[PDB]
Amino acid sequence: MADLTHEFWDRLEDVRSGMLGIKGQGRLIPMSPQTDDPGAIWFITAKGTDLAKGVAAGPQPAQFVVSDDGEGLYADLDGTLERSTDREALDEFWSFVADAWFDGGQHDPDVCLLKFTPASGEISITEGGGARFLYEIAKAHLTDETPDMGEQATVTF
Amino acid sequence: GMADLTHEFWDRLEDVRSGMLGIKGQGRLIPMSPQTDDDAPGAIWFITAKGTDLAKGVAAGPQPAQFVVSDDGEGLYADLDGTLERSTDREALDEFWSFVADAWFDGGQHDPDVCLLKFTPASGEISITEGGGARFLYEIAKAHLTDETPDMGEQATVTF
Ligand SMILES: [Ca+2]
Ligand SMILES: [Ca+2]
Ligand SMILES: [Ca+2]
Ligand SMILES: [Ca+2]
Q1: DSSP 3-state assignment of A53?
Q2: What is the DSSP letter of B74?
Q3: Which of A10, A64, A116, B33 makes a 20 to 30 Å CA pair with B115?
Q4: Quick one: A75 exposed, middle or buried, by C-beta within 10 A (0-12, 13-18, 19+)?
Q5: CA B81 to CA B119: how far, in whole Å?
Q6: Where on this chain does Ca(2+) 1 bind (chain B) (predicted)?
Q7: Are strands A60-68 and A18-22 parallel, antiparallel or unpaired?
Q8: Under an 8 A CB cutoff, do A17 and B99 touch?
Q9: Residue B151 assigned to a binding site
Q10: Following CA atoms A126, A127, A129, A132 in sequence, which dihedral angle do they give, to the nearest 10 degrees?
């Protein structure tokens, strides 16, 4: 549904890490997703890496996987990864953590802004916190019904 | 070392509450609860329903599978290739059974819908880091203060 897509973007904003990769090329690796305003997931990386070199010629079909317990967001997304030369996006998603890795600032020659546009994906969202979890377990013994911790669906972006 | 990074994977995987599991060439990865013990490493165990796609997918026999992990609290990130299969091991079923499993399956561990799945990793690209707590904040702050890149941790492609 539309609410599941809006909830995905809302919770993705606080997700510190995710597993990114180009389809048919190696395995997935940990990356720091950046989002603000929705539409795409943005990443800062080195030009010498396999992901940077893989999207040098053009946009490639890619995969991005999220599994965050803190936010309760679980997603396997199919999409498109590409190198972005956008100055505004680069400046927006630059941070104090990024400066530690790249000593030359946001305009460092080794810096590479990747843009992941999701196409579709299977998403699970954990509605409620520990309070609902505690209630659903108590309810499970009272009713013999399986706990409903949230929504689950396959979405087209 | 390769063996040292492998030992540390099993060491931290116990505290990982969730992971993304799936059979290769069949749908997308879905969230599952990995149950392991670092005293007996080698396999990652999952308790699921017989009516699910993962259960039905491995009913005929063992199938190539993928298990992806990404945990900031433990600093364990891994994309693993392996084999998923049905297990009729009552010892493993009883060891990894929990209060959460009682909620989903009203008839205990000997419930008709209960299905124990065993994922044996073959290989994978694993990253081990200092986490995202006190040490991570210090390491980023120290990187700025010394003109050195942060010493996050180790990364390698491992064969189990
Ligand atoms: Ca669109
Ligand atoms: Ca341990
Ligand atoms: Ca232990
Ligand atoms: Ca510096």
Answers
A1: helix
A2: T
A3: A64
A4: buried
A5: 9
A6: 11, 14, 38
A7: antiparallel
A8: no
A9: no
A10: -120
**Strand, helix or coil for residue A150:** strand
Please give the method by which this entry was determined.
Answer: X-ray
Number of domains within chain B:
1
Beta strands in A2-156 (DSSP E): 18-22, 29-31, 41-46, 60-68, 73-84, 111-126, 150-156
Give the number of the ligand closest to the Cα of residue A79: 1
Q: Taking a C-beta distance cutoff of 8 angstroms, is the pair B42, A94 a contact?
A: no
Q: Report the alpha-carbon distance of residue B59 to residue A37 in Å, rounded.
A: 46
The two counts, helices (H) then strands (E), for chain B are 5, 7
Measured distance CA(A45)–CA(A83) in Å, rounded: 10
Length reported for chain A: 157
In 3D space, the residue among B120, B113, B119 whose CA is nearest the CA of residue B56 turns out to be: B113
In whole angstroms, what is the distance from residue A108 CA to residue A130 CA?
44
Token digits of residue B76: 């364990």
Domain of B58, in residue numbers: 1-160
Whether B99 sits inside 8 A of A69 (CB atoms) is: no
Q: Do A74 and B99 touch (CB under 8 A)?
A: no
Cα maximum dimension of chain A:
62
**How buried is residue A99: exposed, middle or buried, by Cβ count under 10 Å (0-12/13-18/19+)?**
middle
